[PDB]
Design brief:
The structure is a homodimer of 738-residue chains. Chain A has helices spanning 7-17, 26-30, 51-62, 86-98, 113-116, 120-126, 143-159, 183-198, 227-253, 280-298, 300-303, 319-344, 346-349, 359-362, 366-379, 381-384, 408-426, 430-433, 442-453, 469-472, 488-502, 543-549, 556-559, 584-597, 601-604, 621-630, 659-662, 667-677, 681-689, 716-736; strands at 39-41, 47-50. By secondary structure, the first copy, chain A, is mostly helical. In chain A, strands 1-2 form a two-stranded antiparallel sheet. Bound molecules: protoporphyrin IX containing FE (4 copies), calcium ion (CA) (2 copies) and fe (iii) ion (2 copies). The site of one protoporphyrin IX containing FE has 22 residues of chain A, from helix 10, helix 12, helix 26 and helix 30. It is classed as oxidoreductase.
Chain lengths: 738, 738
């Protein structure tokens, strides 16, 4: 309570109206989803696959890499072409030849211009029709379409089967040699690729958009952005520029501490529990050196084929296996960065004593946390090699969906570990607010943050092996755009301000009101901002209305970062003994520079739904993904490491001269391979994706254009700058642990 | 010179690099203009009109209102449809009917869908070809196109002719009854319309865009935006956001006065010259009341036809006359407000004495201005009614182009009056900085601003009666986007800081650096920002490449207006005698609010070239025009009126209770007639313009859709608030002049 009745009500007011908006629209994503047809038949009488064969074909797609091989409805990896827009153009060109063979005498390519436009108008009448029969379950597609589907089916049966004809196209797609040894799996898998491009073509009931909201930009069947799609883009621009101006207008009008001579953390000297965190500062730097070194190993498969300078490590370590470890070990060391600074802050609040069985609680968390890492990395190896039986795949092995690629049995092992980290926080915080005090204001906010950071991983359930892919793309982003983006940015603002409150630099009054205006602004457009990962995947038009207007308000408090980047840096002059923490106070400054240039600048370039239409599935998304994940949550795990290196080894200097290469190799290393080798490839692809089609921007005839070859062979001029910038950090921490 | 060596070098550096970028591209706008063909002939052998007939048709179009009747290439008025898209659609449907009449047996409307798409591909083949013969001067268009042009000539001959059949379509376009009594004048005007929509269809040499950069969005002949258009749009967006964030960053990191007891302006008491400004302060409010009444009179012709509750004032006072007066008297009173403020500031700088024959120039300049006003209005009335002979039209009468609609002789009169104001400034300012002092830092900037504001009306020359329309649209925006937008915003910052410096509130050190940091920022994207009025008018793609990217940087220093709207309002508390200037210190705050909400927010909504494509010529442009013209330079001539009411009548109070109404009527009326009756009309026109075509968003089958009728019949509820606010302000000024 206290005098904070205004602030503590407007945070619950945001978390009540902007939290039912994932629930009032969460039923809209379910019952407006593209249905899987019960029976696919031809008009002559034969019966093709049904809804059982599609779902078993989905499990065949998961066993080869899932979204880490080639993207489906845009989301995935960006080397192999998306199989819902590469199946589409190969099916329409098969139809255009089977409708020209009995038209004059020739094919679609050898007709003059006025007569070849009399066939693309017949494509719009058949392929933008023949939807479901209103719970009759039948499809009954045309017999000229039954021959074109079976014609292109033999091309995808020959691509995943070790055939000698399609070499040097399995080399530009970074598929190993087989990718599916069994024969009935890839006969069932390419039935699933039909349904993922059946829904991309058929019209919804009465409207002028498709089931996937007109996504794969194809000039044959008239796939152009909607009328309501362009009108909801210009509304999304005026929300931003009238939000930035009205924030600085209300900031400049509605406004209106001697430091101690000793550091108050060295007066405690707690030996038994906080000395056991030396392992956790090793697991951060061991996974960080392993995660960069995979990056130079998965970017090598982009440039070359599968050679690796002599013998090929391609039948053991293919592209979709080294990419799966590159994302998954990245989310671990960001997670165990906060887990070190979380458990360090547990016994420091309740005086300087530990709870009962605290060191016994820490020493069994770490050996269960390392059980998951080397336990999930075996499941990826025994599933992409296709050794494990396919019925037991989802539980241990490989899930298929990116950012949740650890198996279901191992996924409980990550959820049980953070839930065990939850009770080790609450046993050390309930003797601090259940005591009769009157200053439990920051402690009540931090209690709500630790309760939310460990229970929002549980939304990674509610989807199993065989549920509908629109349901698998709704609960998946609840832990990527709400647990990594949202609630890692609440816990890293309070616990950041809790340290500056304890050292005696902020006066605990402007450390709480600054942590409820910077905890409700990030949540105003953060919980209903989940929906900008669900534009073109089985949704209606109001889903891009909630996710393009209420998503610009998480770009409003990110551009204005002059404050909270100077008043976290001018704390250096407030004490003579703030030279010992100079380098953590330089990492919490370069968090702010990449929270406006990775989340604000490069994050709004792809936000409005006319410019996510042409960009979704290109090389402009890993510009935003590399910069907003290492820049914002990747310098916090290195700011909470070189701070926790102090107070547990308070005798070793940080050795400047090494840190000036360990800090200025991460910044300039990240801003040189983005602005030379990932951004200009993302604009040659954008110039082709809006001119010709979506299939043209990922086709292998385009990605070997002799200008996109010299623009990814120049990744290595920035890769080795990042490499030595990462080695100089881990050599410091290993030297610091002695 | 002095300690200001950095700023006074970077301002000349900006005005040196961003000023050759107008000349080196003005050469490109000249030598890449769409040529007028020397001879138009048919393929059978006959000879149609030539280029002289096209130029006489241009003069005939000028004689009836010019751009105030119906827009040409988007620029103009927004009631009658743009003739270069309406002519285009009528000519294309005439060609489709003449090519279907000899195809099977029917027309384009009564053909099935696959066979009517075999004629639009022939429209794409014939109409996107047959350009000029490489300076051969001939056209030699197809005889079917000759028959289609001769067929659609008769409708536009019948529309401007008093013909009975075409009533109640001459009433929804607000044309009086005749608009052209002579017959050869409209017979040549139709040929001019043929030229201005011939340039909208033909392909440039080798490229894939037209001469007017693919402008009139027509799905028949494939008029869709380019790829480089969309690429420069996304580049413009990232330039804006990366500008705002870096400006706030470098503001927050790179930083580092007793008031007197008496007002220092009442200590001078200069009686002979400054008492002669009552005529100017009466002329400002007289033209302001007359202009608001003309605005209320010209919006009635939108809602009703030409009735005016009984007898019609339509053959004497048509829509074109009242619209021309509504723009021109607005520009006149906005100019003479600054003129009176500068002439007040003239003798105060050189101590408290006047130059020789100072009262005589003031006493003749007022009668010269009022002579120019009544002669221009008499010329408009005697030119639109078609009484004055067509040989003598451009000199006195009506020019045709909007914002320069006063005739050439009256234009020389206005330029001579502003030059007389210039020499009256320089005869009073040169004995103040030629004295041996060391404080001529602000006065040099003010002298350069006076030399800028008084000379660049002279770029309204260099185009006469018969030059090419791309040349007439290059020198026209040199006095609308560089003399009104740019150099009225330099003269209003230095004079404001000079007044706040002379009064003894700022310390003259932060009044100079803040008047070059806020004079070099507005000029970085202001002089090469002219080019966003020249996207789709006879230009190439480098012109929009300059005018998007280098124009987003004049939106960057406008959103951040928390500073320069609080440090100009917190000057009120610095003295007890700053209650006498309370209302100018609210006008100079409403200037900042509408400068961020009419130039930033609603001004960037229409800026990027993919969203100016569908918007150019709609009801979203008068939103930005009414907001940024009365909001920024309209409260400035009401701040410099109620400040100059002090120090010449320093005995009459401002009478609060009336000033609250005269402020919060203007603000609430301008913010309520924009957000109710001009913004959703603009959004409905945007939706229909991006769905169907450009002809559909201005057609009279669409602008009576029964929802656009109730959305402009609610203009009056915002009109009467603005009306009563204007009446309260003028009755206050008339009561104060006694
Ligand atoms: C020198 C440093 C790095 C290199 C060479 C590298 C390599 C790569 C490459 C080539 C991709 C593109 C994969 C594809 O095309 O499908 C990628 C994706 C990704 N990287 Fe890195 N990486 C580096 C640093 C990092 C770091 C430090 C992190 C996080 C802690 C990270 C997180 C990610 C993520 C999340 C993706 C997935 C993007 C997406 O699929 O949309 N990267 N990495
Ligand atoms: C602040 C921390 C942020 C993080 C950690 C983050 C992380 C990510 C990642 C890793 C992806 C790639 C997902 C994938 O490959 O499937 C992504 C995509 C995306 N992000 Fe962010 N992001 C952040 C901020 C933002 C912001 C502020 C916006 C504002 C509009 C935004 C808009 C988007 C959009 C539209 C996509 C979809 C791009 C696509 O699917 O191709 N992000 N985000
Ligand atoms: C109650 C107040 C006003 C009313 C009813 C009014 C009426 C109108 C109307 C209906 C238009 C649209 C003409 C068309 O559609 O072609 C217009 C245009 C315009 N008005 Fe006003 N007006 C008002 C106030 C003002 C003021 C105070 C200014 C001060 C400078 C102003 C400047 C302009 C300009 C420059 C245009 C031309 C916009 C363009 O052609 O793009 N108006 N006025
Ligand atoms: C600050 C003072 C400003 C003033 C006095 C002003 C005035 C005007 C006026 C009167 C028009 C209408 C021209 C016509 O009807 O032909 C116009 C158009 C336009 N303005 Fe502004 N403007 C200002 C700021 C801005 C800014 C900051 C931008 C930034 C991008 C901008 C972008 C545009 C564009 C693109 C158009 C063309 C719209 C069209 O032709 O339909 N304006 N301006
Ligand atoms: Ca991805
Ligand atoms: Ca206009
Ligand atoms: Fe997101
Ligand atoms: Fe402009």
């Amino acid at each position: 309570m206290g005098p904070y009745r205004r602030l503590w009500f407007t945070l619950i007011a945001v978390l009540a109206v902007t939290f039912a908006l994932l629930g009032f629209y969460g039923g809209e994503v379910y019952r407006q989803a593209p249905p899987i047809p019960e029976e696919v038949a031809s008009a002559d009488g034969t019966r093709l696959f049904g809804r059982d064969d599609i779902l078993d074909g989905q499990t065949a797609w998961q066993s080869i890499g899932g979204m880490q091989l080639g993207s489906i409805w845009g989301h995935g990896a960006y080397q192999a072409p998306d199989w819902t827009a590469d199946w589409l153009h190969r099916e329409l060109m098969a139809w255009l030849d089977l409708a020209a063979r009995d038209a004059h005498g020739r094919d679609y390519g050898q007709l003059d211009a006025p007569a070849q436009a009399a066939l693309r108008e017949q494509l719009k009448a058949e392929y933008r029709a023949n939807r479901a029969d209103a719970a009759g379950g039948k499809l009954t597609l045309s017999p000229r379409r039954a021959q074109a589907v079976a014609q292109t089916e033999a091309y995808y049966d020959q691509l995943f089967s070790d055939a000698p004809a399609l070499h040097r196209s399995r080399e530009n797609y970074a598929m190993k040699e087989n990718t599916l040894p069994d024969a009935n799996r890839r006969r069932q898998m390419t039935h699933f690729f039909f349904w993922t491009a059946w829904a991309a073509g058929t019209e919804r009931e009465g409207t002028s958009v498709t089931y996937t909201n007109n996504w794969p930009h194809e000039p044959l069947i008239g796939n152009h952005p909607s009328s309501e799609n362009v009108m909801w883009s210009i509304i999304s621009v005026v929300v931003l520029l009238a939000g930035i101006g009205l924030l600085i207008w209300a900031w400049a009008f509605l406004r209106g501490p001697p430091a101690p001579a000793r550091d108050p953390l060295t007066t405690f000297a707690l030996t038994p529990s906080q000395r056991a965190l030396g392992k956790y500062l090793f697991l951060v730097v061991a996974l960080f050196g392993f995660q960069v070194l995979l990056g130079g190993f998965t970017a090598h498969y982009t440039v070359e084929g599968q050679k690796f300078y002599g013998i090929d490590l391609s039948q053991w370590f293919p592209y979709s296996l080294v990419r799966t470890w590159h994302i998954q070990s990245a989310l671990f060391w960001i997670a165990t960065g906060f887990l070190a600074a979380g458990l360090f802050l547990a016994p420091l609040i309740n005086g300087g004593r530990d709870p009962k069985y605290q060191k016994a609680g820490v020493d069994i968390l770490f050996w269960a946390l390392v059980l998951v890492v080397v336990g999930s990395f075996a499941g990826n190896y025994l599933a992409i090699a296709q050794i494990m039986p396919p019925d037991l795949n989802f539980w241990l092995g490989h899930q298929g969906y990116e950012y949740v690629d650890l198996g279901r049995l191992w996924q409980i092992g990550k959820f049980a570990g953070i839930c065990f980290w939850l009770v080790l926080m609450l046993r050390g915080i309930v003797p601090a607010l259940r005591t009769p005090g009157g200053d439990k204001n920051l402690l009540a906010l931090l209690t709500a943050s630790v309760g939310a950071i460990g229970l929002f991983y549980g939304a990674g359930f509610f989807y199993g092996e065989r549920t509908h892919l629109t349901v698998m793309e709704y609960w998946r982003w609840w832990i990527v755009h709400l647990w990594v983006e949202g609630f890692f940015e609440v816990f890293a603002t309070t616990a950041l301000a809790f340290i500056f409150s304890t050292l005696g630099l902020v006066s605990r009054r402007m450390a709480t009101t600054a942590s409820l205006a910077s905890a409700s602004l990030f949540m105003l457009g953060g919980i209903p901002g989940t929906f900008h990962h669900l534009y073109f995947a089985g949704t209606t038009t109001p889903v891009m209305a909630v996710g393009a207007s209420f998503s610009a308000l998480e770009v409003v408090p990110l551009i204005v970062l002059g404050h909270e980047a100077w008043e976290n840096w001018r704390l250096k002059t407030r004490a003579p003994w703030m030279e010992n923490l100079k380098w953590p106070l330089m990492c919490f400054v370069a968090v702010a520079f990449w929270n406006m240039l990775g989340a604000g600048v490069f994050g709004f370039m792809i936000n409005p739904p006319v410019s996510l239409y042409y960009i979704q599935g290109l090389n402009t998304t890993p510009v935003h993904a590399h910069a907003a994940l290492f820049g914002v949550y990747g310098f916090l795990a290195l700011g909470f490491t070189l701070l926790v290196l102090r107070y547990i080894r308070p005798q070793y200097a940080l050795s400047p001269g090494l840190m000036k290469l360990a800090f200025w190799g991460l910044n300039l290393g990240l801003a040189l391979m983005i602005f030379t080798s990932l951004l200009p490839i993302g604009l040659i692809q954008f110039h082709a994706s809006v001119s010709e089609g979506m299939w043209y921007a990922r086709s292998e005839a385009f990605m070997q254009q002799d200008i996109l070859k010299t623009l990814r062979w120049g990744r290595t001029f920035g890769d080795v700058v990042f490499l030595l910038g990462a080695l100089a950090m881990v050599v410091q921490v290993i030297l610091g642990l002695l």
